[PDB]
């Protein structure tokens, strides 16, 4: 299913963006290293038009669904960050190449007791991380999911008070604000 190779945040009533937090615009957020947009768009690029359709004052939902719906050649007008510059760009959709990287990456248990784990992940650097949120719950079993957070400058956390010899699903989310970056990372562990 042809893809453009980048993610967008923002939109009127949307969940904001880490580039110009005051601006509800549509912003290029993550760009895939080997994909269609990688030598053309950058993080923080505000989309103002795509294939003739204005992205000014657009809702996030509609922006995603227009982008997904477009032919294969998508022509964008972006504003790049004084100061600002308006730029037209052509991006051709790709079948094609890649599963997207996870955010953060390389989640692992490095030490364990019967009821405690030290987990670590690779520090996510491409975008501002205000905190990491860690959740853990018993794998596919009737159990709620428990969660806590560590500062964005931390790359390990301890999970405590686990029941001994149970399977737990552990997820780590990189949060800019209340909401997190796409592709949060998960492992399971007995």
């Amino acid at each position: 299913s042809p893809e453009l190779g980048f993610s967008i945040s923002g939109g009127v009533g949307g969940r904001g963006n880490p580039f110009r937090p005051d601006d509800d615009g549509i912003f290029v957020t993550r760009v895939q290293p080997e994909g269609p947009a990688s030598k053309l768009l950058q993080p923080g690029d505000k989309i103002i038009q795509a294939n003739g359709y204005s992205f000014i004052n657009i809702e996030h939902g509609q922006a995603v669904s227009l982008l997904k719906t477009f032919q294969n050649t998508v022509e964008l007008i972006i504003v790049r960050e004084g100061a600002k510059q308006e730029i037209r760009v052509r991006v051709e959709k790709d079948g094609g190449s890649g599963g997207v990287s996870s955010v953060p990456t390389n989640l692992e248990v490095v030490a364990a007791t019967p009821t405690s784990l030290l987990i670590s992940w690779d520090a996510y650097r491409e975008l501002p991380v205000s905190y990491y949120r860690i959740t853990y719950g018993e794998t596919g079993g009737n159990s709620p999911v428990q969660e806590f957070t560590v500062p964005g400058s931390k790359s390990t956390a301890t999970i405590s008070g686990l029941k001994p010899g149970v399977d737990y699903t552990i997820t780590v989310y990189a949060h800019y604000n209340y909401h997190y970056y796409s592709s949060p990372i998960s492992i399971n562990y007995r």
């Binding site: 967008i8 904001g16 996030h60 209340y178 909401h179 970056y181 949060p184």
Partner: peptide, 8 residues
């Protein structure tokens, strides 16, 4: 919470 960004 939800993702702040969506892939296209």
């Amino acid at each position: 919470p939800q993702p702040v960004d969506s892939w296209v």
